[PDB]
Amino acid sequence: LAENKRLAEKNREALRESGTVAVNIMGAIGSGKTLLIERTIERIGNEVKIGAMLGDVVSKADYERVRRFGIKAEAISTGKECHLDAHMIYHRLKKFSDCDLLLIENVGNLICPVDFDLGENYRVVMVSVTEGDDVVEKHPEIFRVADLIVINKVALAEAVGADVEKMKADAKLINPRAKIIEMDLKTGKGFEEWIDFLRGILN
Amino acid sequence: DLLAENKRLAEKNREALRESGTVAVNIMGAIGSGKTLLIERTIERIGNEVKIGAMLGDAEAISTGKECHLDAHMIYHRLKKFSDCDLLLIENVGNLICPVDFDLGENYRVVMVSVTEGDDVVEKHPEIFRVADLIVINKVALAEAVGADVEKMKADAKLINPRAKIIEMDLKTGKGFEEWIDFLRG
Ligand SMILES: [Cl-]
Numbered sequence: 001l002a003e004n005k006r007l008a009e010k011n012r013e014a015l016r017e018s019g020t021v022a023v024n025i026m027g028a029i030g031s032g033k034t035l036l037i038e039r040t041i042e043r044i045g046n047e048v049k050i051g052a053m054l055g056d057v058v059s060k061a062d063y064e065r066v067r068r069f070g071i072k073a074e075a076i077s078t079g080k081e082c083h084l085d086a087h088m089i090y091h092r093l094k095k096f097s098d099c100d101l102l103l104i105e106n107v108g109n110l111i112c113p114v115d116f117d118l119g120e121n122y123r124v125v126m127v128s129v130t131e132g133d134d135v136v137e138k139h140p141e142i143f144r145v146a147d148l149i150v151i152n153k154v155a156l157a158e159a160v161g162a163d164v165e166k167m168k169a170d171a172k173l174i175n176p177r178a179k180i181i182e183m184d185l186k187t188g189k190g191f192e193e194w195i196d197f198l199r200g201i202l203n
Numbered sequence: 204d205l206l207a208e209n210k211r212l213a214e215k216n217r218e219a220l221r222e223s224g225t226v227a228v229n230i231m232g233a234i235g236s237g238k239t240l241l242i243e244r245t246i247e248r249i250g251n252e253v254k255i256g257a258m259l260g261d262a263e264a265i266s267t268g269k270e271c272h273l274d275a276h277m278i279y280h281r282l283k284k285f286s287d288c289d290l291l292l293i294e295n296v297g298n299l300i301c302p303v304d305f306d307l308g309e310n311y312r313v314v315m316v317s318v319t320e321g322d323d324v325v326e327k328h329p330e331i332f333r334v335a336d337l338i339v340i341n342k343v344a345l346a347e348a349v350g351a352d353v354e355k356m357k358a359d360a361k362l363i364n365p366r367a368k369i370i371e372m373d374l375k376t377g378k379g380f381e382e383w384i385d386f387l388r389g
Contacts, residue, residue: 029204081269082205082271082301082304108205109304111300111301111303111304112272114300115271115300138329141300141330
């Protein structure tokens with residue numbers, strides 16, 4: 001962790017020098033990190049210069065979709081690690097020095113990323129209701145580090161037997177300071193709130 | 204899933220171990236929990252009655268490379284060397300988080316925690332303490348001199364992991380070090 005902390009500080013300073021705001025977006029595979037990133041690019045990509053670093057394996061169609069908006073994007077090679085670390089992006093940040101907002105998609109995992117500072121400005125932790133409504137209480141460590149917690153695909157809550165209000169309450173008990181958004185991209189629920197949070201951090 | 208390959212090598216590991224009669228122990232705990240010391244004093248005690256192989260994530264050292272945990276693949280390469288061992292003692296990285304997801308193919312899981320890590324270390328790390336078969340609270344004799352509520356640690360562990368066995372241990376006094384043997388023995 002010592003070498004990570006060192007590179008993490010360098011990533012943070014470099015991000016400060018360029019005025020780029022970086023968001024470490026964590027969550028299990030299927031939590032919907034990629035779609036949220038695309039939808040974001042689609043909504044404010046014209047007003048705001050966005051970079052994307054994708055640390056989950058992304059399909060070809062999704063790579064086309066993100067790159068289609070002329071947005072700078074790239075797969076992060078994570079090799080054998082169950083999480084990103086400051087070293088993985090240390091040499092990549094320069095290519096993104098011209099972005100106002102750098103969206104960093106972490107590995108699909110709710111455990112390993114806890115202890116790794118990437119040098120980011122904000123941490124988001126995404127969870128889908130399809131993961132079970134005890135997923136927050138099962139993973140206190142990761143939910144504690146979040147500045148914003150996204151409970152996702154809520155319009156499927158009933159269908160899957162998941163209790164959204166319990167997920168919200170467990171999140172708040174574990175992390176009293178974090179903003180919490182209940183989100184369903186299909187129905188647009190929570191999206192404006194998400195965008196508003198991004199505008200807040202860029203201004 | 205992303206652990207698909209780890210699961211594959213874990214089964215393969217779980218086979219080689221069984222067919223060789225070798226029993227493996229995943230030993231987890233913080234960077235100072237005292238895993239190395241327990242292993243030494245384990246070999247010093249019953250290292251004459253049974254053959255003990257040792258792999259250090261922190262007898263041979265395992266290079267974890269860029270990872271924060273051991274994975275089944277690191278074990279798999281070196282398993283042949285220990286096919287003629289009664290007991291295999293695997294010392295995982297000094298880390299209470301990463302090792303949670305990673306089956307190594309082992310028979311038993313132990314998590315060691317020093318009282319010098321705080322009396323809420325247990326409650327802060329439910330995920331790992333939940334996979335333990337045995338939990339070792341170590342250096343207990345320093346609990347008072349450091350202001351750590353040992354009874355709290357236990358309650359937290361029992362809440363999170365009822366079926367797990369718990370031992371209070373201090374090697375400066377060989378406290379609990381004997382029931383640790385009673386455990387291995389079985
Ligand atoms: Cl790793």
